[PDB]
Design a protein around this ligand. Sequence first.
Ligand SMILES: CCN1C(=O)Cc2cc(NS(=O)(=O)C3CCCCC3)ccc21
Length: 133
Amino acid sequence: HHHHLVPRGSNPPPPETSNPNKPKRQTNQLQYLLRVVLKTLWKHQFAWPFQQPVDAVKLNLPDYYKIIKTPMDMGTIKKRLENNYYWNAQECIQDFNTMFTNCYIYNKPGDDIVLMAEALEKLFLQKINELPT
Ligand SMILES: CCN1C(=O)Cc2cc(NS(=O)(=O)C3CCCCC3)ccc21
């Protein structure tokens, strides 16, 4: 709206969460990623800002998508795991890493959201360290 004084930043469509063209392939590592890693992060007191795609309009981050080219969030990851979108653990780990990276490159060091990301990432990496073979 020309009426706006403060810029608004529009949102992309959210990331895809299923892929009709891949077989339904379950592994112990993917089960662990959903049921141990994602679940432990999801229930953490700092998870809530990470649980859905960044809404740059509702959160007043009008420059978010200028800075972040590959958005990712734990809601998308959770859905991708539940839908068997991933071929392997590495692909899921990549999406968690993207989510954390986005936070670290958009927000200033020391920002509260960065401190939250750091606590979550520590837990994530602890859990990853115990990935079943
Ligand atoms: C994690 C995604 N993210 C950012 O990178 C910056 C940001 C800001 C907010 N805004 S918010 O929910 O009003 C709250 C989030 C906790 C820090 C203070 C601001 C939510 C998510 C994100």
